[PDB]
Amino acid sequence: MRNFSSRVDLQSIVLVDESQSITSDHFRACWNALIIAMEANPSELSSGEEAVMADFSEWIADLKADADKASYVRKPAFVYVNLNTGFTCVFVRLL
């Protein structure tokens, strides 16, 4: 198996506003969506789970760095796939 696809549920798509505060409820919801997706214990993240979270943090940072300038968004989306369960979610910064 080299080729994965998933049809993603409306509820598994999260629209991300990088203008929202880092401390915001918006961003808390995004992080929770991801932990749930990974079926992870936040207090005891595996190394694979850590990599996902770090990648998510880097994704956010770039969203902010792009929106800081009046640029477009270079990487407008974040995909996470649970390869055990096939659960896929997609965070998107609209436009």
Next chain:
Amino acid sequence: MRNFSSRVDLQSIVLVDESQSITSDHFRACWNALIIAMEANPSELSSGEEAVMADFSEWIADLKADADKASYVRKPAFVYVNLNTGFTCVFVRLLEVTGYSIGTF
């Protein structure tokens, strides 16, 4: 092994307009993008590649079946991942919002 994530380039996100005809060039454009992304042989698709393209054709038909029902759809995105190379693309059905407002509801 268990957890994949990808930061997706803008050009690897495809906007899909489900209101196009079943037979539209647009859908064939989307189809090719997926064939390309799999590095697949449209002539001799493997089982795994054929599963992907059937997933997709099904994805499109559900957009249309669902768009007759509501302004949103049940499954608005289609994710493809080359698990060998990490390459990911994302087909998304969004409404384009255009027009004017006086600044009230």
